[PDB]
Amino acid sequence: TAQVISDLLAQGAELNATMDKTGETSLHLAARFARADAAKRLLDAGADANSQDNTGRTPLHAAVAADAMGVFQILLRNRATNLNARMHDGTTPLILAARLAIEGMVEDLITADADINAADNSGKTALHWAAAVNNTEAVNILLMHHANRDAQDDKDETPLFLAAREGSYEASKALLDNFANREITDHMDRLPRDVASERLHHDIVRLLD
Q: What is the DSSP code (8-state) at residue 125?
A: B
- Distance CA(110)–CA(114), nearest Å, equals 5
Please state the closest distance from residue 110 (CB atom) to Mg ion, in A: 10
Q: What residues have CB less than 8 Å from 199, skipping those under 6 apart?
A: 165, 167
Is the Cβ of residue 78 or residue 197 nearer to Mg ion in the bound state?
A: 78
Is the Cβ of residue 90 or residue 104 nearer to Mg ion in the bound state?
A: 104
- Distance CA(97)–CA(63), nearest Å, equals 10
Is the Cβ of residue 22 or residue 73 nearer to Mg ion in the bound state?
A: 73
Q: Which stretch binds Mg ion (CB under 5 A): 81-89, 108-116, 137-145, 197-205?
A: 108-116
Q: Which stretch binds Mg ion (CB under 5 A): 43-51, 61-69, 100-108, 124-132?
A: 100-108
Residue 157 engages Mg ion in binding (rule: CB under 5 A): no
Please state the closest distance from residue 35 (CB atom) to Mg ion, in A: 20
- Distance CA(59)–CA(128), nearest Å, equals 24
Contact 105, 68 (CB under 8 A): no
Residue 186 engages Mg ion in binding (rule: CB under 5 A): no
Please state the closest distance from residue 92 (CB atom) to Mg ion, in A: 18
Residue 137 engages Mg ion in binding (rule: CB under 5 A): no
Residue 108 engages Mg ion in binding (rule: CB under 5 A): yes
How many chain residues bind Mg ion (CB under 5 A)?
2
**Nearest residue to Mg ion on Cβ basis:** 108
Please state the closest distance from residue 103 (CB atom) to Mg ion, in A: 9
Which residues are paired to 119 by β-bridges? Answer: 125
Is the Cβ of residue 21 or residue 145 nearer to Mg ion in the bound state?
A: 145
Judged by DSSP in three states, 119 sits in strand
Q: Any alpha helices (H) in 150-191, and if so which ranges?
A: 159-165, 169-177
Judged by DSSP in three states, 148 sits in coil
Is the Cβ of residue 29 or residue 142 nearer to Mg ion in the bound state?
A: 142
Residue type, 96: L
Report the number of secondary-structure helices (H) and strands (E) in the chain: 13, 0
Task: Name the residues that contact Mg ion, by CB under 5 A.
Answer: 104, 108
